[PDB]
Symmetry: T
Subunit: 155 residues, 12 copies
């Protein structure tokens, strides 16, 4: 069970600064924490991680997952959450569970961050938990897919 | 470690109808699922559940948790999320982790549901996962408190 | 038929002043008039009346009616019309006809009274007829419930 | 009493399709039902019916009623509800009761249907009861006109 | 010099009621007052008056004045001032002076009366003077046309 | 196929004012060009032309097309595009393809021209090609109708 | 004169959270200070205190004051200031002076705090003086009541 | 019968430039044209003219006319029309006819010019006629005062 | 303590127009009443009064108070409350307590009066008590200053 | 004439998702149909196709067309229609006809799709005809180019 | 060249506090720095400085410059940037280069500071560089005026 | 000092047309002018230039500069100024001075150009001086960096 984790613009800069709202934990460290979570719960998942500052590369990537062996996507589209109708359209046609994560609470900052076109397209949205948000999303992804598979077999 | 779970207006009507967006699982069933999660992960938590259709009873309850042995609150304020400045003010003065859950994705419905005064006051917000959202919040609550306790002891 | 009549905040103050914008008839008198409209029409309708200033009591009451032997609700949610998404959510799950009444025309007053969340969730809305609006809702509820019965019997024999 | 019943744009297309959002009863049938509600109630009421797709014909008609022997208007201005300040201006000078009816609940549809200029100028508004709304307006108009008569006689003897 | 005076919806109801903001003077009386003004100042104008409650009849009429011997239009489009893009488009193509009159001050009533699509298309707008507004417009019309004729001859 | 071409307010004034933003081609010339487009394509199309400055005349004509011999409508509602919910409602019940045409690009002018109630009710909208837009609407209409027909025989056979 | 002091949601949490934006003075201490202000001014005022987190309890209390022994109300509706048309409606029918107090300046915080439905229904509003605001409301209330009374005897005598 | 004519900010710059929307006629020339109008119609009025770029001087001036022998005010508050609640409050308490004039059509320019707080307080508003607007206002002022005087005497 | 009282545009016209919404009490009378309030309270306060219709004169005066002998400002900026960011900026740098007063309740009039830039810059705002508001501002100012001073000696001693 | 066809984000996913709102026809099939439309019309047109999910790749391509051999552009910018001022700016300096196409009617979907920055920069916009829209854009482009050319020789000769 | 430097409301309070958001340099010091930037660059520029809190004095001053021997204006209109259509109107008729300066970045503060009417009328705007912004405007004005001179001479010899 | 100069979408098209709204100087020429302003001022500044139409390349580039030997950024984000929260986020974490430049005055054009997310995150913004704006940013960056150095040395010896 391959889960694709997509990390949007500026997420690669975690650690390398603004620790007063994001922390000194890096993105590579968050990805280690996700692997730890997989093993600690013995969840049968194999993660692939992708970060980019390009809207088009996020779109290419979601598209590429269509009819691939990726069963689900966990995404933090970064500032593109608030602006990217194109990424939301891509999420809409993905044909699999997509879950949005934000490290910060996007209801609790500037007004321009409240809208998320991408989160409106996702099955579910997690915000405000920092790095832990991504393990939260892993957990949901497993339950969502297992549940979908029960509807498969028992039909 | 007592965690208070507060469930707002109409949450008691889960099961008893609109299963086409909320499902036939009842609120009492969600609370059983949370207990199952506690035992299955052997988390040292003791939950207390409270449901009400009164804004004032949610406020009384959050207030009552101040300087009590409740260490955290998981809340689904229901339709009061979008309207209740009074509940948000209560959340602000609670002095402990508060986490908001919604069964549905509130970015993906009517425009009047997008605002959450209460979620803006909470540390973190979870939406769109159905019943599972509450186990997601349990998991965050444990990590948040454990982490706070590390900052306690190692200081 | 048991019909439940819910009267929201400040409706109990009818005729205990503002005899200009609302008249000098009391809530108790309006309810008497409704009873008299049933009795006179020989309608098989038992009315039950509930006034409250509490949003949560209105939701409690609408919830209580689910799986009860109430066939319908006539509601004036008062000021909560404009603000209560919670009461609209309760109406949406009521599973029975709910008719909203306002004594005044809420299109013809302050801007803040124009939105009615509860009204939008109700099948039908009556406004600006004063106390008469409640007798209009009675007439409507009876006709709605008859229609519903005839539809239900005529489908069960097919 | 002569009551004038004005039916605005596209109301003539009732039952000539969209049998889902509006039903399959025709405008002619609704008017028959209204006639039958008068006859059956032995109401001293003569109904006159007017449908038009023209804003100017509706205003002409409301104007024509001033100093006429029409005692009241029941109006469904259709889409002109939301846009016609001109028809609201005509209602405001009508000098007689005007009741607005909508078959559908205009609080529960597209945003552009929520404003009713004409509704705000009418004494009272009924919406979301389908064809029944017209019989509800009839009931109301009769009661309004009675009240008006009793008030007028009881002041002239004082 | 023919001047067409166009009077919009409900103007025919002047006198016949709401004298508490419009007065007991009728529309036919305003048209007499305009003729009085023509003779009293010995202005070489011949007025034609047209009232209608139809948007389409106002449009037909303005159109009909194009390449006619009407040299100018004085118009009170009534409630169509606030709504009629079609009447404004007609005014725009009229090819002659058009002047808007309102009996009431439309900056000083409801918010829905503040916009005038038609007045924005007119050369000039007069409001708030009652019946006198129309003699004011007559006076401007004469000066405007005389001035245009000076630019004609002296070119 | 009889196709109805409805032209809204002021369209009759083409080539008789504003050579700048519109053309110097008249409305009659546009209609000749459309006829020419049919005849030389040897299309089996009989065009019917109707211009009016009256909203209600447009609604009358759309209604008259219901259950008629007309298989489609090409419409430029003029300034009523932006204002007429009534005409949009008529389009919604037309029961046949309706194509909206504008000479000008309505996304690129005043803010008040951007909304088209009528365009949102139409299946397709063409704008900003000038008189050519109408021939584009003819091409589309023939193709829509041929596809619709091939579909009705595709289905009657399974 | 009995004066009623109504304190809305969370006001009971003063001095038990957020020393920063509010004080460290408790609600009971504020109430002692008001009593102290009366007693030392030798004012003939009997204060009655009521705090609640329930909108409906506030409306109940305002209503209960109609035709009672209370001559005035000093109110801080808390967050319900910004949301409660219901409480504003209650204030409008109170029939006696109602003064709104806020500890903080509600013009100088979040945008959602700027509106006060309740303040607009009150005769006067005091904000941003902290606990002192309540003593200012006491001073005003005594002066309003004394002026009102002197006026009732000014008039009965001519 | 003294009529005060108040001319607001930048009106003194008429002539001295932007003749492509205002013309080469100066303010002093407009005031001569008003005197010409008085004599030509033999109207018993004595005008006083005041121009200023100060909001406070317009307010002082309107105030000063209260209980003076000024019977009416014709005002072009300039850009202060759109912004000056203080000037509108002054107009409201003036106790005599006040008429607003604009040389340009303020419904037909930028959106920030559409509001006129001052015109909403005035009895009537004239726009879009250039210099002639002020003679239009003179004419209305005479009729308004004469009419008020008929209501005086015949009462 | 010298306290400066700044009165904005049109405040000088009190009692010389609109007996209705304002009083019939003049501005000079209000100023006498304030002096009277000080003298009878045996407050050590020397009031200085300044009225102007000029925004820039208000800003000049607030600035002139910086590093002066004045310990506080009571201000009614009149219509400039709603418009003057410049005056709000001046208030922000004043370096001493500034209290805003309105005779009327600015939450309960036209929409354009609701914003107060100046009020948001002031520590506290009093509205809708009429001339009494000014005596309330005096009471508050003395109390604010006494508390501030007691604090400066509370701190120099530890 | 070489005509460039630019297809924006997700257009490559046609027929590989959402048979409902779009077709089941693929992007390559649409491009074949356009080629077919040229060849059978014996048009002298050489089409060049470019799809990308990158805003900057669209801007690169429009720029690359400046002073190139391409005489026109047919563009569907996809979701960038609603967001991309950058692409609109590129269109504005393109120096040749640019036609915008949408498969769907963007006036009739979510509010966020209504604006098209790119459409307002284009000379003409076609929407809501599905894949046929592209052939309509081809017809228009040939006609625009032929008219432009006839004009350049109309003018060089006087 | 004579360049006029206009400093609007509260700019005289620079360095007389808020040493945090604005710094501790005075207006007089900034003007000294500008003088020193001229002297050091051996620029043939005479600077004239004017500060005022009066909107009317700023307009007077800009008007006074018309037909004067001032070749340019550097203006910081302070809070009047956001509100003064009157000062923008004066700038528009100045007939010479006008550059707006703000010490702070007005895009990065309260919403009410984002609009600059005066800035929109100026050729160019500089913000968020503190006192340096004035030296930047000096550099720009010199370069603008040189360019203007070279253009004027090189056209007069053609 | 190494200063990085980022030029956003369509800036490469300068002087390759719209010689009216933007002039006929090229991007390459502007960069030459900047180089010449350094050389002539004998500034110890090495300029590096980067143009791109890709939002992601601009973010990549700003990120690349973190922990590099670039001391500062001069940026014109072009149309991405108004839309890119992503580029603003990159600016906010740059940890070095970033100055925004626009050739045109973005307060004086379409409404959609008034917001600058990137500008608000930059320390300072320059607009409406054409190519000169870049030399103004150079002057500023040098002065900013000097100030920063003097501050840093004078604190390390304390
Ligand atoms: O014409 C309208 C709508 O424009 C209006 O919003 C509701 C409305 O007034 C009502 O519910 O009665 C009416 C609804 C309506 C229609 F919109 C319509 F198109 C019809 F053909 C029709 F028969 C009909 F009843
Ligand atoms: O009537 C209108 C406008 O009101 C609409 O905005 C565009 C519109 O639908 C179009 O571009 O076709 C049309 C434009 C228009 C006109 F606005 C107009 F005034 C004419 F005289 C005319 F001939 C014409 F074509
Ligand atoms: O309850 C509120 C706010 O919601 C309101 O905006 C201001 C308010 O009315 C005031 O300043 O008095 C009050 C402020 C306020 C609180 F918001 C609050 F959470 C408290 F615990 C409290 F004690 C308190 F005073
Ligand atoms: O000048 C104003 C108004 O513009 C403001 O809205 C209220 C206001 O600040 C107050 O209530 O004190 C004040 C009200 C006001 C006036 F508006 C006014 F015109 C007066 F002549 C007057 F005496 C007066 F007090
Ligand atoms: O990309 C889009 C939308 O974002 C745009 O609103 C309409 C749009 O430009 C059109 O109707 O052509 C296009 C619609 C659209 C999609 F939104 C989309 F996700 C696809 F996969 C697709 F194939 C498609 F055509
Ligand atoms: O790209 C843009 C605009 O989107 C922006 O609003 C102004 C802008 O940032 C500026 O004035 O520098 C820049 C203006 C602009 C362009 F919009 C453009 F299309 C060009 F080709 C160009 F060379 C150019 F400079």
């Amino acid at each position: 069970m391959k889960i694709l984790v997509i990390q949007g613009p500026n997420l690669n800069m975690l650690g390398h600064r603004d620790p007063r709202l994001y922390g000194m934990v890096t993105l590579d460290q968050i990805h280690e924490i996700m692997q730890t979570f997989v093993k600690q719960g013995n969840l049968d998942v194999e993660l692939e991680f992708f970060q980019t500052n390009f809207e088009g590369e996020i779109i290419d990537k979601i598209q590429e997952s269509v009819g691939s062996d990726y069963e689900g996507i966990i995404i933090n589209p970064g500032a593109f959450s608030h602006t990217s109708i194109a990424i939301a359209d891509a999420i809409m046609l993905a044909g699999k569970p997509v879950i949005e994560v934000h490290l910060t609470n996007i209801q609790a900052r500037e007004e321009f961050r409240k809208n998320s076109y991408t989160g409106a397209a996702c099955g579910g949205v997690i915000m405000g938990f920092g790095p832990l948000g991504y393990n939260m999303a892993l957990m949901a992804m497993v339950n969502i897919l297992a549940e979908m598979k029960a509807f498969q077999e028992a039909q």
